[PDB]
Symmetry: D2
Subunit: 455 residues, 4 copies
């Protein structure tokens, strides 16, 4: 999921459309914008892409000087964010979340026992309920208080008629950054949103920090003095857009260095290096460049394989009909190929890619993954978690190489990964979460905790 | 436009969906399939993408053992091909064209003076009328006769209840190839269609050749003994998909060598090489690889900028809101950049790209084009032609350079182009049309001839 | 089908929208408007209702000072009229037909043997082909000549850049009338269109007459000196809108008199008179009024049973789920009911209505039909013809009574019908066609002649 | 709004579709069904008509043995009912309301001060919140308790996995009735739903009664011992379907007697009586029948003037383009006309109708309304309330006549209204609410009370 907010701009909702658009890759299962003129909050949101949602429901209707918007990844319209709430006497509150609350089950029951009704399936709503059923005089304080009860990953955009309030979990598991458009303030899951809308980078939101932005500026305030830096590794490996800089480190560049690292760890002798569009192009470029083997487009992703697309019958696929990707035998025929991918999860893609490549007449396929094996669940986002079984969880690397049918299989080591990304922080893992590789989670996982999809 | 036919396959219409899908890049302004069981011809076709056309109108309805399908590029439903015609006594005829008939105006008047009514704007219809108002006993012959009266570029798919008939203009200006799916025969504008559906390459259809395919096989027959090989250069430079092999030469590989050629002609000293997604990625890879400068993603194309997408107000764009592309300052900031593009037409894109790149903090932009300047009209397809004025037609490489704002600007020479593609044919231009560069057209252009868009 | 044209009005296409709208009942299977400014012809047309076609495709795009429009009844977007044809040297022609050409098969072959290609399934196209392949210098003359070769029912609207041309078959089987909007001329299948758009009635187009309307006025010209008046009876009984006056006789009033006639022929003793909405409301009002029995709404038609509507499973219908109509037991329970309907065709509706009425607790059902039995095919329109078998064609009135389950069944006699409508022409059937009752067709029916649906 | 529930039927959701369909006239601004198999509650709902909602979202998905459905009138998807609520431990609750809670503002603040979040704008949600934040052990009791805190009009359908619970406000302002389908129980706003789905009438739900229906039957329980019968008069005059029997009195028959009453109060000498389709057809029939003047269709409502329909420019309307209705001059030309309408609100319709009728050449128009003037707000439904100003509130009868331009204007007296409906309940107004005529409301209207639209 991706979130974008901006405060202090005539066309805040348009900017949000564009910002949110640049984050559209974060998920395409819904989208929404809520905007404020100072008096009223306007809002349109729906399922599907941002474009399926607007000009299928007018962007003109939503008007304001501040807005927050959310792009939802999904595994019901009630769940499409931002969530907006109105009240008789106390005005309005819109909220948008990226992450996952690892104690949400707990809190829902407590809040339900206190008499809260839940209408969505979102964590964002839980935050809404804590805020309401909170003692403090001010919202700033209701929020600070509520935040400190949440466990897990969360980047939160919240706004009312008069302010925008931004908060990041004290591990800073998800990225969140701040930018300037003149005097406007902009806040986005990824920096690419800034590039796209004309915003200048300012800095990251600090884990455990909270920003209150309004017509007289921005103020920062802690809500968790002790912080334990562990940003999601997959943001770097896979999930963010390559033009984004996570913490000033560019995602393309990082992923390319992950390729150089792979080349230094497990070089093999070969004729062409291909990436997989679009997950592992930057790794592949980096790998080829390190080894001296030429980078080729040995695999093509069909640009138009949306949800509209009719799946070939399984019998057709046996026949050889491709769906999303195919191997270019124009390029690989008679070559021995290094196929670089960002990661392996189920293993199903790499097996398929190895098979197509051989069916295009590659003589060797050497699969090289720019991540350590993925053997543990994620609990910090629906986007990053999965219900699918993990191959790395039960198969050794060699057991895996046999399953995908590669000639060789190589994963980046953890040091390689950490070294490749080049993150500066002082501890044995550079302020990154590595839970899904190592099994060592940066927050406690309770026994009532459900997997993000399980909601 | 792109055309796909297959004869001898239970699921000919499904295969055509998938084949046509792989050619979807050829144009998205309409699409259609016509299929035959041996008795009746079924057909669904509409405007928009293949997916907007199917599951918006059922693919299940169209059933057969042969089908031909067309994907239309455009600058009205009546014009979406294939064109299907029925008759009381003489059964049916479906026709699909890719190319442009440089004498269509002439023929229309003659056929109109003979009492033909025209209901579409397509060249395909002209062929239908010549066939009908033709003397010969058989269709094969009516077609051969009709064909010989056409001037220009044309790949034709034609079919009836009982046969499929394929024909290519005797210059072979557009590609057309044949493949096998078991015993089925398959014919497509590009080979990538074969890759995608499980077809094996057989050969190209010969310029001036005509194929008749039916339940007992395929037969070839000339309709123009003297042929003059001049395949569209842009198919190689720009227009085909990179996994396609035009005449056994792979389009990715070719375009990459065009990069190597650029590097040998006009190397400059720089820090990063970027392509433009997706037009000039392969050129860029090749250029970087030749020069030793690192390949980076210094430009990103937003994946979701469909026709649904709301254009930023011109005032917003002045503000810095991007549409389709943006420059990654995460990558270029402080670097001197070689920006490789396939071609320049209006010049408007390259100017923009140069500006964004400088706004992302690139210190130098060196624009290097993997084509000779484009200074003459195309007359051999709506896809390849344009109503926009050509910058290269009135500006020296210098006045252009100044106009896009590049530090340097370099076009591939013609020899470089010919050498890069590396066609082996014996004549001064390797069996390629270079008309839009050189002004020397491979067919005669009459005075009544309209530009392809003018229809 | 219904046709509307107007010449000499800034907003001719809007007027046509509205005119066509008032004729929407004529059929809902497509619709189109073609308009001219004097230079170019603009045109939008599609399948479905006029509103599904406009604001699903803009009315703003079609602009002009004359337009013709068509509303199509159906049992292909190629078939939606008007048909528009363009040419290199000779400008444009749009044509719209209401009726059916009883020799169309003949003509198509002849025109096909002369080398015409047919792209639609419409009669309108045949006229287009005769006009083109016609010897005379002027269009007026080409049309007159072409017309005289047509056999059957036809009201034609035709127009070019400069004129509108209107023609009615020399039997005047379909209505067609002329009106004035200021200085504009208006032509419509039904007069209700005039009421709706602010047009004044002028007169009927004479059977075998042809109008040429242009910027200097209207001129009349015969194309068949000998005429034989036989207007479709169903236009009066059923098919036209009740606010329309066919030949100055109002359709409501006529149908009501048909009710008075029924009352004079076969009065029965009963408690309530119900019509069937909406086919036989006026008849029912008239019947009740004659007999003195009270008019009630003993049947209700659900206003929202469009094509979107999910048909109840046949098992549900056995359970008692209704679709379009139901009987009001609030009104009929314990009463003996006269149920008046305009006509019987298959018989399936009257049986159902009799059953529902008995299930609402009516003690008697007396079915009284304001038309003679329908025992012969129609050949003069798809609207008026049917592929369904005619009950009256094989069943005596008695049998039909037994089949619908009525207590009594009564059809209007032919004299009653003729007397009720009240037309004053001097011949044994008052200038009406009674073919589907009597079997005596007012034009010759050839052996190659297909039923209007068979196309 | 209209509500339909049925318990104990394999196809409960289909039946609900059909039942809801028959209540579609109640409003077309949304629709929804929730169904239960005993374990899970399934639900589809959306904006627009029932058919726009289903087969645009599958009815097959929603399955069960009980269901409740709602059809919403509106002047958001969040507001489309039924409202469905789920919980971790306590299962599910769906609720649907028809009516309006005249103290909802009060209760929302109280519930908001107790920490409730409100996500819809509906009264239905308020009931949901009272139920949750209620002390009692059982739901039956939580509801009874919650109900007793509501002020205003309310018919409520509520259901869970195991039961259906129905309740009517102790004034019985909205109709609600019970029927049988074999052993199934059916509950609907109007009886016409029963007719349509094959249900037998059982009785009305008693004002202040509550039904609990489950797999072992139905049980009744009061929640307000003292009841004060005042059913909405407009249900009879206008709002219900003519085949519905409100409290055993048929709505057609009643409205017809309202015509007889009008005829007895203010007969005038005239030539034809027309109603207005479809609001005042039954009144008109009754009037004509009383006076002996013939009933004619002097006005026609265009059947296809949906929300899709393009409104004629105001300039066109000045020209004489009609929208929904037009006058039949075929019928009224030269006649003096009694135009009977159910009611007058703004007065805008009657003025228009009088004008069209004169433009069709009626010599006199005598407007006769089958309701007392409407001079006071409604507070008991969005359907029945309006934001438009009431003409009768500031204009004397004779001042309205001048405004609509009638020759004469006549309202039914209150006695006439009461007498016509035939009602005899032992009080001065027969158990009907007459608030919008008299100003004497049957419940107290608080100072915080907003007009139903104001939400
Ligand atoms: N506009 C864009 N340009 C380039 N890369 C992008 C863009 N948007 C997202 N991405 C990248 O796409 C990658 C995944 O692409 P995709 O092929 O859809 O993934 P996968 O094949 O694994 O399902 C991500 O790792 C991300 O960096
Ligand atoms: N599925 C695909 N994968 C990669 N490249 C593709 C694909 N389909 C088409 N192309 C390529 O895209 C290029 C043009 O992409 P695009 O960015 O849309 O062009 P442009 O930016 O010039 O308008 C073509 O030169 C073609 O080779
Ligand atoms: N706007 C209208 N108002 C009243 N009657 C109309 C209107 N439009 C068409 N009609 C009438 O509707 C009748 C048929 O209505 P419908 O119930 O659809 O026919 P059927 O039930 O036989 O299929 C026609 O006989 C025609 O006169
Ligand atoms: N299927 C139906 N058949 C007949 N009358 C109906 C039907 N459904 C609703 N009605 C009636 O329609 C009347 C209003 O019709 P309409 O013309 O839409 O109202 P109005 O013109 O006042 O806006 C109501 O008074 C109601 O009794
Ligand atoms: N790690 C990861 N990879 C993903 C995700 N979604 C798609 N992918 C892609 O899926 C690949 C592995 O797919 P799998 O092995 O499960 O078939 C990775 O290369 C990556 O490109 C996700 O959420 N996480
Ligand atoms: N030559 C050519 N380039 C095209 C066409 N359509 C899009 N392009 C793209 O447009 C670029 C030049 O755009 P322009 O200079 O006209 O603004 C080329 O790099 C190519 O990527 C086309 O039909 N022909
Ligand atoms: N005569 C006739 N009736 C039609 C037509 N379309 C619908 N109807 C209706 O169908 C009724 C008879 O239906 P059927 O007996 O075929 O079931 C007539 O009352 C009329 O209301 C048509 O084209 N012709
Ligand atoms: N009383 C009433 N009439 C309504 C309503 N909606 C539509 N109408 C119609 O509107 C007519 C009066 O329209 P008006 O005078 O406001 O222009 C009544 O005859 C009735 O047919 C409603 O909610 N209440
Ligand atoms: S477990 Fe893996 S995917 Fe999840 S936050 Fe940590 S690094 Fe990211
Ligand atoms: S046969 Fe019957 S339906 Fe046909 S034109 Fe004659 S009267 Fe009309
Ligand atoms: Mg990948
Ligand atoms: Mg390019
Ligand atoms: Mg009828
Ligand atoms: Mg009314």
């Amino acid at each position: 999921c991706g979130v974008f907010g901006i405060w202090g701009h005539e066309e805040a909702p348009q900017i949000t459309y564009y910002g949110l658009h640049s984050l559209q890759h974060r998920g395409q299962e819904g989208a929404g914008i809520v905007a404020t003129d100072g008096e009223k909050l306007t809002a349109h949101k729906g399922q599907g892409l941002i474009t399926e949602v607007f000009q299928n429901g007018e962007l003109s209707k939503v008007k304001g000087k501040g807005a927050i918007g959310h792009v939802r990844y999904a595994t019901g319209y009630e769940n499409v964010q931002p969530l907006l709430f109105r009240s008789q006497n106390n005005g309005s509150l819109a909220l948008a979340h990226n992450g996952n609350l690892v104690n949400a089950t707990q809190l829902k029951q407590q809040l339900e026992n206190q008499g809260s009704i839940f209408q969505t399936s979102s964590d964002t709503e839980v935050l809404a309920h804590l805020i309401k059923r909170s003692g403090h005089f001010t919202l700033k304080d209701q929020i600070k208080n509520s935040l400190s009860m949440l466990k897990g990953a969360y980047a939160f955009l919240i706004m009312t008629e008069t302010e925008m309030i931004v908060a990041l979990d004290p591990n800073g598991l998800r990225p969140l950054s701040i930018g300037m458009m003149g005097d406007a303030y902009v806040v986005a899951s990824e920096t690419c949103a800034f590039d796209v809308v004309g915003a200048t980078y300012l800095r990251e939101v600090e884990p455990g920090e909270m920003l209150i932005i309004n017509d007289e500026g921005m103020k920062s305030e802690r809500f968790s003095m002790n912080i334990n830096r562990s940003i999601c590794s997959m943001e770097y490996i896979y999930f963010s857009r390559p033009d984004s800089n996570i913490d000033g480190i560019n995602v393309h560049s990082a992923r390319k260095n992950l390729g150089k690292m792979l080349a230094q760890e497990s070089a093999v002798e070969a004729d062409v290096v291909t990436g997989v569009p679009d997950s592992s192009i930057s790794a592949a470029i980096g790998y080829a460049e390190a080894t001296g083997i030429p980078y080729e487009l040995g695999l093509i992703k069909n640009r138009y394989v949306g949800r509209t697309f009719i799946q070939p019958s399984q019998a057709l696929r046996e026949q050889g009909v491709r769906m999303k990707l195919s191997a270019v035998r124009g390029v690989v025929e008679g070559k021995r190929v290094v196929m670089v991918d960002d990661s392996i999860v189920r293993g199903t893609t790499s097996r398929r890619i190895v098979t197509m490549l051989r069916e295009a007449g590659a003589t060797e396929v050497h699969v090289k993954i720019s991540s350590p094996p993925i053997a543990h669940p994620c609990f910090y986002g629906i986007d990053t978690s999965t219900h699918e079984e993990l191959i790395a969880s039960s198969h050794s690397v060699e057991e895996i190489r046999q399953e995908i049918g590669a000639d060789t299989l190589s994963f980046l080591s953890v040091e390689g990964l950490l070294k490749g990304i080049g993150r500066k922080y002082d501890d044995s893992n550079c302020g990154q979460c590595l839970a899904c590789f190592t099994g060592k989670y940066p927050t406690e996982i309770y026994q009532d905790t459900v997997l993000p999809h399980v909601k």
